[PDB]
Amino acid sequence: GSSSGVTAEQMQEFKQSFDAFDGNHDGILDKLEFRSCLSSMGLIDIDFTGGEDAQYDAIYNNVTKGENGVSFDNYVQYMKEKNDENPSPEQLNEIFSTIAAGKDSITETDMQKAGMSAEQIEYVKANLPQKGDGYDYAAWVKTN
């Protein structure tokens, strides 16, 4: 609903992530155990001694919109948000369509010259077939 775009793998792992704490294993988790989850994860405890679990509630406030508990949207939003904050090499796909645009083959001179340095080069050519020089970025397209 909120950030819609979860994958099937997550539906298994994130499920394990709550299941470790939550014994209802429904696909949703209650406040109490999700509290234990975030506590054992090294995130939350009752820092402000006086408010009844208020540190969680301030976060719960963000995870729940008009629901109660951390359900399929709610939970995943909280988790994925915290994952989305860490970028992947996804943007490099766009970059390949910037440089190697119209081509199948992406060479040294496609990447190195375009500011993409050695650490990237070796990664790109490890994931994308080293077809001489001029890596097959179209592996992502053709599946090869």
How far is the C-alpha of 17 from the C-alpha of 34, rounded, in Å? Answer: 10
Query: Quick one: 87-144 is in which CATH superfamily?
Result: EF-hand (1.10.238.10)
20's CB contacts (< 8 A; 6+ apart) are 37
- Residue 96 near residue 106, CB atoms below 8 Å: yes
Residue 22 marked in a binding site: yes
Residue 68 marked in a binding site: no
Residue 136 marked in a binding site: no
Q: List C-alpha distances in Å: 106 to 11, 25, 60, 122, 142.
A: 35, 47, 47, 13, 15
Please state which CATH class domain 1-86 belongs to. Answer: mainly alpha
Residue 24 marked in a binding site: yes
Residue 84 marked in a binding site: no
Spell out the domain ranges in the chain: 1-86, 87-144
Q: Name the token pair of 55.
A: 């540190």
Residue 28 marked in a binding site: yes
